Each structure stands twice: as C-alpha cells, then as structure tokens.
Amino acid sequence: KVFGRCELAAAMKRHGLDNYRGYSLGNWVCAAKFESNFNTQATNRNTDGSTDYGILQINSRWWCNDGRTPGSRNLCNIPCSALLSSDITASVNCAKKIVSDGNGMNAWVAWRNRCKGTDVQAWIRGCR
Amino acid sequence: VQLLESGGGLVQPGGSLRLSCAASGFRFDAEDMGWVRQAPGKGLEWVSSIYGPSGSTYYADSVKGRFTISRDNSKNTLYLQMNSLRAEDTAVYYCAKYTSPPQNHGFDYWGQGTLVTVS
DSSP states (O other), rough: OOHHHHHHHHHHHHHEEEEEBTTTHHHHHHHHHHHHTOOOOTTEEETTSSSTTTTTTEEEETTTTTTTOTOHHHHTOOOOOGGGSOOOHHHHHHHHHHHHHTGGEEEEEEHHIIIISSSSGGTTTTOO | OEEEEEEEOOEEOOOOOOEEEEEESOOGGGGOOEEEOOOTTEEEHHHHETTTTTTEEOHHHGGGTTTEEEGGGGGTTEEEEEOOGGGOOEEEEEEEOOSSSSSSSSSEOOOOOEEEEEO
C-alpha cells in the first residue's frame, strides 16, 4: 500500500519512533517520503549489487537478507521479503537497530540529502 | 574526495581493456569500492566490488571470469581488467564508493565515467 502522510505519521508514532535516538517523528516521515514515496512495496536495485526494500528502503548488504547480495551481513536477522508488507513493524524494528549504530540516520541516503537540517516537523504538521 | 576514470576507447570483440580510477581524499587501502556501468538506454548496473582490508572481490554474473578488479595501494588507483569483450559490454564505466557506510542506496559517489565501445 501507499500510505498517506498523516496516516504514516500515526503508525510510526504508535510504533515508538518519535524521538527514537533523538530523531523526531518528522525525520522518520520525511525519510519515508524521499526513500519510498510512502510505498510499502517499493524495491530498488543498487549500484553495489544490493537492493533496498520497503517503506524505509532497508538495505540487503548490511541489514536484511535477499540471498543475492555481495558481502551481506544480515545484521537485522530477517529476509528482505518480510519487509514488503502493509504492516510496518518489521521495517520499524530494523530501523531502530540501524539508527543505533555509529551513523544514526545518515544511514539513509535520501534522509541525509533531503531531510537532514530541514523543517522536518512540517512533515507531521496538521496530523492528529 | 575524488575518483577519476580513464581510458576506455574502442576495442574489437574478444579484445581486452584495462580501466583505471585515480582516487584521492580518503584512506584508499581498506575502502569498499567498485565499478558500475551504464549501457545505452539502461540504468546504472553493478559490475564488481572489492571490500575491506581483505580485498574480497565480487562480480556480477555477466562478467564473472572475464573481469578482474584490483587495487594498487602505492598509487591509490583502482583497476578493472576486462577480457573477452562482447558488444553488450559497451557502456560508460564508473568507479564508485560509499560516502558514509553502512548505508542504503549502494555506492553513492562515482566519477565522471569513461566510455567503452565494443564493435
């Protein structure tokens, strides 16, 4: 499914992302927008032979297993296919582990390029 | 930080070609790096990688056994040896790297690119 902006804000709130590792909920919503355009089924083949999966475009080299990626480590211990559903739980769980490493949200390339330092809270403004 | 590819050119099928990539502004010897190409009217496609201090190499299936990726640490230069060239190997080739790993989007930094034409 393609989530609405305020709809995804709320799911992410209920899943404990607001202020997770100091990153406010607009951060997470802005990330989704520019990574997947709110589309839980989005998949993109990358220049290193890895693939990114799901609403937060979780990567198959470091975090999930798709069976076909060079130097994969599977640090989330999950199949990438399990991240393409309308339930964002597994993407969120993997997000929390990702953001707890050195890199913080800089692990999401669209976040660091389009979101970082911006009025990210505008992404959840007007939501209930 | 900079990557700068040379020298593609025209080669007959069956021929060979060695590409280089002069690298600067970072610690070359242990950096994850690779080659990517963009063929006429297709997206960027991964070709090869070399990872970490071990220098573990990986290759896309269309090139395995024909290409070899190499580092020259003394000169901070990355090489791609291309043998047994075929018409479908025609593409712009790019040397590439991660700007801030671990990350998504694959390699996000690449050079200007060098053209290889195989006819």
